[PDB]
């Protein structure tokens, strides 16, 4: 059922856990570095887990998609064909920016954080900068021990702060991926949908130095020896059975003003969905004619597709449950309840008014701010602005450098510049520049940016063409030129005749001012947000409702049972799908073009010892009433005995609006069954070496 519970809430859910069927003790789940919780790792943006004592890590195909795509070319397309390393020396690097984070310690820092904030006094900008300074110090202290990365999390609008310390594995390798037609069976058609028939898995291996310490990729590295790893279930998972997930959900907005919901539904999602669908169309059309553009853009395209469809589905779910009306009524009830408390409600009523005003300030420039951000996120403008900003930051002492541009961020920056080689084609990026220039030009006078208007020197199709022709003269298209500029100094950027660098130099002062506006708004938010959100929480508890913080990329637990759901009267979705359902969808065309070995094996009823006799087949995917979101892709699903029974990978269509208003009847996790991972690796795209390593051979 509902709830992305923090580990500290375990006492509160221990009862519920027992009642839903957990047979492990709550103490055993409390130990976040023990068995089995210590096997759960952040990737992040996704979750994963260890599954062998020699550092094998299982996650979803969508989570490894970037890695697979980085190792693919038009001629040798691992997204399409799969990958399998027969021995660990055949494993390929997942990319310099790939990471496995293993949890080491969580520390409550709430009191200190809040004291650092109060010390700033009345000024909003100073308040932001005080919290930044606190965070940077804390993190520097925590990361003094070599091999560890730390992160500061704010919960419940700034009412609680915790510091996480992780071991940071920096040499992640691809060990196995099923072919794309298994990994992403049904593609974007079946994404966000049940019935689902998707082999949504892949394997990495984590590596460290011979001294046991994290290191970047080197042939002298060796597999990491995890303290804990998961084991596959020996009992067949069935309808009604207990399941739990631990992982790293990114963000939810269940605590939000009505107006923040209204702006999101009425403007944010439709705008972003439109821009994304427009970019998809161009890249799709271009890739039909150029298989290099098709492979290099595939991961970008997977994300545009996934997010735009998600937003379409949220808009549809809001209408299904009248989310606008629920938010309006709930807020009118909270505001009544506050007014009724006289004196002591006033600070929350005041915080509400201040939050609403801050949203209005945001809103006045939203089109400008979005359009500029996305124009500047095309590949060459993005490279030039990032690198020029790095050069500005490098002239300051490290502790005063903007987060993302400190010494601790240089590996990521550099790795990004290298990875882009596999994700950029000039002729494609040009069409994306043109799209964004055309969108910029539609902005009204008061949403335009002087620097960009001047640089453009016109407001029509001729001017756009002239600007694109100018930018096409950049040399940032090559990896080596980008790294040259990664190390260069500010004056070297300001002297350049590289047209993308010139753009960055021209707009930078404007980006910096906009950043200051955002920092300022954020400082006012730091004052008002905790007070209102606490009231929201207090109201929810007085109503007997579940109280848990919105997701914020930190470790959460969710639990429940395997069960279907009913989309409409006269119909139910069953909890499982089956192998015969995969073949029923075969068309021989992407995304319904399963490997021939799959089609043959099902036709011959080769079930590989994995048949669940209660469904008459090997199970493929299943539904459960767990509470997961973006970030939970790849999270292990565990049974009553803490054994692996699948991996979380998606939500059903109606579930996605739960990011704003939770609907228990239509919110389900979609998970890929452990048995289907094993089945594919036996009968379809075999990996006997992995099955043996996981003691299922």
């Amino acid at each position: 059922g509902e709830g992305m519970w923090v580990p500290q809430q375990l006492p509160e859910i221990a009862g519920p856990l027992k009642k839903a069927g957990l047979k492990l003790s709550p103490q055993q789940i409390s130990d976040l570095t023990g068995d089995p919780m210590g096997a759960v790792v952040a990737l992040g943006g996704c979750t994963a887990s260890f599954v062998s004592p020699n550092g094998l890590v299982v996650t979803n195909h969508a989570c490894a998609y970037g890695a697979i795509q980085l190792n693919s070319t038009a001629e040798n397309n691992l997204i399409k064909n799969g990958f399998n390393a027969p021995t660990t020396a055949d494993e390929v690097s997942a990319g310099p920016n790939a990471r496995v984070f293993v949890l080491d310690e969580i520390t409550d820092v709430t009191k200190d954080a809040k004291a650092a904030i109060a010390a700033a006094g009345d000024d909003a900008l100073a308040r932001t900068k005080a919290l930044e300074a606190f965070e940077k110090k804390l993190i520097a202290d925590c990361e003094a021990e070599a091999g560890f990365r730390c992160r500061l999390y704010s919960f419940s609008g700034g009412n609680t702060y915790r510091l996480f310390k992780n071991l940071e594995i920096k040499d992640v390798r691809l060990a196995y991926a099923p072919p794309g037609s298994v990994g992403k069976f049904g593609g974007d058609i079946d994404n966000w949908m049940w019935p689902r028939h998707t082999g949504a898995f892949a394997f990495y291996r984590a590596y460290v130095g011979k001294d046991g310490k994290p290191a970047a990729f080197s042939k002298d590295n060796v597999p990491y020896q995890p303290k804990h790893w998961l084991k596959f279930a020996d009992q067949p998972l069935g309808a009604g059975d207990f399941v739990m997930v631990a992982g790293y959900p990114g963000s939810t907005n269940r605590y939000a003003l009505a107006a923040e919901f209204d702006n999101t539904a009425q403007w944010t999602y439709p705008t972003i969905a439109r821009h994304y669908k427009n970019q998809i169309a161009m890249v799709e059309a271009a890739g039909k004619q150029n298989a290099d553009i098709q492979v290099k853009y595939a991961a970008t395209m997977a994300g545009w597709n996934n997010t735009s469809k998600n937003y379409d589905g949220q808009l549809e779910g809001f209408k299904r449950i009248d989310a606008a009306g629920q938010k309006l009524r709930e807020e009118a009830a909270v505001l009544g309840w506050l007014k009724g408390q006289g004196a002591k409600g006033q600070p929350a009523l005041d915080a509400h008014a201040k939050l609403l005003d801050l949203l209005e300030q945001s809103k006045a420039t939203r089109d400008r701010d979005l359009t500029l951000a996305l124009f500047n996120n095309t590949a060459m403008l993005g490279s030039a602005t990032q690198l020029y900003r790095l050069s500005i930051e490098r002239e300051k002492p490290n502790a005063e450098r903007e987060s993302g541009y400190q010494e601790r961020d240089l590996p990521a920056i550099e790795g990004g510049l290298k990875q882009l080689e596999r994700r950029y084609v000039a002729a494609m990026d040009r069409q994306l520049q043109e799209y964004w220039l055309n969108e910029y030009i539609k902005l009204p006078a008061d949403q335009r940016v002087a620097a960009v208007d001047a640089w453009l020197g016109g407001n029509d199709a001729a001017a756009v063409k002239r600007a694109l022709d100018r930018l096409a003269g950049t040399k940032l298209g090559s990896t080596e030129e980008r790294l040259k500029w990664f190390a260069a100094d500010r004056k070297a950027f300001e002297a350049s005749n590289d047209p993308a660098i010139q753009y960055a130099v021209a707009v930078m002062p404007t980006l910096l001012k906009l950043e200051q506006e955002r920092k300022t708004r954020a400082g006012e938010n730091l004052a008002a947000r905790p007070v209102y959100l606490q009231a929201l929480a207090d109201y929810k508890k007085s109503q007997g409702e579940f109280v848990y913080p919105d997701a914020n990329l930190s470790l959460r637990i969710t639990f429940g049972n395997v069960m279907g759901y009913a989309p409409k009267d006269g119909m139910e979705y069953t909890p499982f799908t089956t192998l015969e359902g995969v073949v029923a969808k075969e068309t021989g065309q992407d995304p319904f073009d399963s490997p021939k070995a799959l089609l043959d094996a099902v036709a011959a009823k080769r079930y590989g010892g994995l048949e669940d006799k209660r469904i008459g087949s090997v199970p493929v995917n299943y539904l459960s009433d767990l509470d997961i979101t973006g970030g939970n892709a790849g999270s292990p699903v565990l049974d009553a005995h803490g054994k692996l029974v699948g991996l979380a990978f998606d939500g059903n269509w109606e579930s996605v609006s739960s990011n704003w208003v939770f609907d228990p009847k239509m919110t389900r996790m979609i998970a890929v069954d452990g048995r289907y991972l094993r089945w594919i690796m036996q009968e379809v795209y075999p990996a006997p070496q992995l099955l043996k390593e996981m003691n299922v051979g």
């Binding site: 992040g44 989570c63 997010t307 998600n310 979101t629 970030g631």
Partner: peptide, 6 residues
């Protein structure tokens, strides 16, 4: 799929 929004 529940990867991070893009």
């Amino acid at each position: 799929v529940y990867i991070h929004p893009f």
